[PDB]
Structure formats: structure tokens, C-alpha cells
Amino acid sequence: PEDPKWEFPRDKLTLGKPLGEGCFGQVVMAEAIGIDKDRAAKPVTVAVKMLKDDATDKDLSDLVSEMEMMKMIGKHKNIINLLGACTQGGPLYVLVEYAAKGNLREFLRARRPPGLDYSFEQLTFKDLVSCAYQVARGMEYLASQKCIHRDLAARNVLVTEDNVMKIADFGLARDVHNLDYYKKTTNGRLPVKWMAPEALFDRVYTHQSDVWSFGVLLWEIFTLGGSPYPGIPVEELFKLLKEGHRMDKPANCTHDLYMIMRECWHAAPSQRPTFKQLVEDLDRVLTVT
Numbered sequence: 001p002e003d004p005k006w007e008f009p010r011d012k013l014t015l016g017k018p019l020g021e022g023c024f025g026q027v028v029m030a031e032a033i034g035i036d037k038d039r040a041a042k043p044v045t046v047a048v049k050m051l052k053d054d055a056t057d058k059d060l061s062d063l064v065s066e067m068e069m070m071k072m073i074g075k076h077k078n079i080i081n082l083l084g085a086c087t088q089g090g091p092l093y094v095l096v097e098y099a100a101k102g103n104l105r106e107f108l109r110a111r112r113p114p115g116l117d118y119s120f121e122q123l124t125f126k127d128l129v130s131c132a133y134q135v136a137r138g139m140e141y142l143a144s145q146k147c148i149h150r151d152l153a154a155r156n157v158l159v160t161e162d163n164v165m166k167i168a169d170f171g172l173a174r175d176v177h178n179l180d181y182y183k184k185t186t187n188g189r190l191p192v193k194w195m196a197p198e199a200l201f202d203r204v205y206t207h208q209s210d211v212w213s214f215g216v217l218l219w220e221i222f223t224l225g226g227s228p229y230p231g232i233p234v235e236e237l238f239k240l241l242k243e244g245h246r247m248d249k250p251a252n253c254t255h256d257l258y259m260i261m262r263e264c265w266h267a268a269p270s271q272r273p274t275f276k277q278l279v280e281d282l283d284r285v286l287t288v289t
């Protein structure tokens with residue numbers, strides 16, 4: 001179906017180097033001429049999501065679905081924003097802002113201290129708290145647009161040239177304008193190590209399950225992109241979650257942040273803070289630093 005305000009001229013777009021592939025799409029760099037409606041002459045670097053070479057019928061509806069979620073949500077400094085789409089007379093391309101510094105996971109990994117006898121700017125504690133705050137701000141806006149992410153992890157935050165956090169990947173994102181929750185009812189491919197028990201066991205999704213994931217992102221930030229539950233099979237995760245295991249506090253983490261972290265990991269969804277609260281919380285910490 002047509003949507004002319006979002007539609008983009010195909011001949012103004014030149015596809016470039018791959019950025020990586022996901023579940024139902026692949027991403028490439030591209031040049032889009034006159035994407036900046038204030039400098040209609042000059043080519044802008046954008047990202048383009050399109051179907052993969054082995055794409056199913058469902059992949060196509062999933063990608064259209066993700067494009068609609070973005071149009072819905074609206075613009076925010078801490079969310080990756082929709083720029084346009086070629087939807088008519090050719091393969092679906094979705095045009096999206098390009099984050100120059102990749103995803104946060106690799107970002108953090110790439111700037112760990114090398115070691116005394118090793119090598120090939122530096123991050124500070126305040127930098128890490130800033131990242132957490134920005135993400136919290138974007139999730140706060142996301143939640144107030146009556147939408148659930150369902151895939152919040154360091155790999156799904158992208159970092160611009162200016163070190164701005166941008167939430168990405170509306171692959172599992174769901175509109176909850178109605179009931180204000182989501183029930184999966186079906187089996188699927190799930191980011192299991194980031195997911196709250198109620199979501200994992202009982203398949204119930206809320207802003208509050210997103211909060212749990214955000215807790216895990218916190219852990220990822222302060223370990224500078226550590227993997228939760230490394231090489232642990234799903235059955236063991238289940239066991240450890242049922243048993244009430246929580247992750248240990250990272251070295252680079254203060255007590256204050258570990259409390260905000262554990263707070264996100266209350267068994268009862270209702271006992272967890274909201275994104276709004278989390279912003280306040282991280283604002284305070286950002287201040288004392």
C-alpha cells in the first residue's frame with residue numbers, strides 16, 4: 001500500500017557495503033541524495049534494511065511490520081529514526097539513520113584496556129552511566145508510545161559519531177495501545193538470556209519485562225560488553241532462573257548502580273522500577289559523579 005510522504009526516489013539511492021544481517025533482513029550502507037530536506041543536493045549516509053537471499057513470506061511481513069512500528073512511535077533522540085522507504089516498483093528498502101560507531105556491545109568491547117604488553121579515546125565511569133541513561137530515556141519514550149521492545153540488549157543499541165545511544169531493532173516490537181501488554185501464545189526464536197521469567201515461562205510481555213532486559217543491558221555496559229551466562233545451554237538458564245540466581249556485580253560497577261540493576265531483577269514485574277523511575281535513578285547517579 002502507498003504512503004507517499006515516506007516514499008523515496010530509487011535513483012537517488014546507491015547501495016553500499018554490508019553492515020550485517022539479522023533474522024528477517026540484511027543491512028547495508030547506502031548514499032541517499034537529498035534525504036536532508038534542508039540540503040536537497042548532497043548525498044547522505046544512511047542504512048538500508050532489505051530482505052535476505054533466503055527470505056520467507058513471513059520475513060517480508062515482519063520487515064513491513066517493523067517499518068510501521070517506526071512510523072508509529074515517532075521521533076526521539078535516543079531511537080534510530082526512519083528516513084524513508086522504496087516500496088513501489090522494486091525490492092523493499094527501508095531507509096534508516098546510520099550510526100557510525102556500530103552497536104554498543106562492540107563499541108564497549110573495542111575500548112577495553114589492552115593489557116600491559118599488548119596493543120594493536122578511553123571510556124570513563126561517567127561515560128558508562130551516560131550510555132545507560134540515554135538508553136533509559138529512549139525506552140521511556142518508547143513505553144509512553146504504548147509499545148514494547150522485547151529485544152533490548154547492547155547489540156540493539158547503536159552509537160552515532162557523537163556517542164549518542166540509539167535504540168534499534170523493532171523486530172519483536174509490539175503495539176500495546178489496547179491492553180497495554182502482549183501474550184505470545186506461540187513458540188519462536190527468543191533473546192532468552194535477556195528475558196524475564198514471566199516472559200520466558202508464561203509468555204507475558206510488558207514494559208516491565210523490558211525493564212528486566214534493561215537490567216541485563218546494565219550488566220553488559222559495566223562489564224564493557226560481557227556475555228551473560230557464557231556458553232550456558234537454555235535448560236541451565238531455566239534452572240538458574242527458577243532457582244532465583246542473579247548475576248554478580250561487575251568490578252567497574254558501584255554499589256549504587258548494582259542496586260538499580262538488582263531492582264530491575266525483582267521476580268514480581270510490579271516490584272521493578274519503571275523506565276521513568278530508571279531515568280530519575282540514573283540522572284541522580286550521573287549527577288553525583
Ligand SMILES: COc1cc(CCc2cnc(Nc3ccc(N4CCC(N5CCN(C)CC5)CC4)c(OC)c3)nc2)cc(OC)c1
Pocket residue numbers: 019020027047048049066067070080094096097098099100101102103158167168169170171
Ligand atoms: C528499528 O530499528 C532499526 C535499526 C536498523 C539498523 C540500522 C543501522 C545498522 N548499523 C549501523 N551502523 C553500523 C556501523 C558499523 C558496523 N560495523 C563496523 C565494524 C565491522 N567489523 C569489522 C570486521 N568485521 C567484518 C566484523 C566487525 C562490522 C560492524 C555496523 O554493524 C552493526 C553497523 N547503523 C544503522 C535498521 C532498521 O530497518 C528497519 C530498523
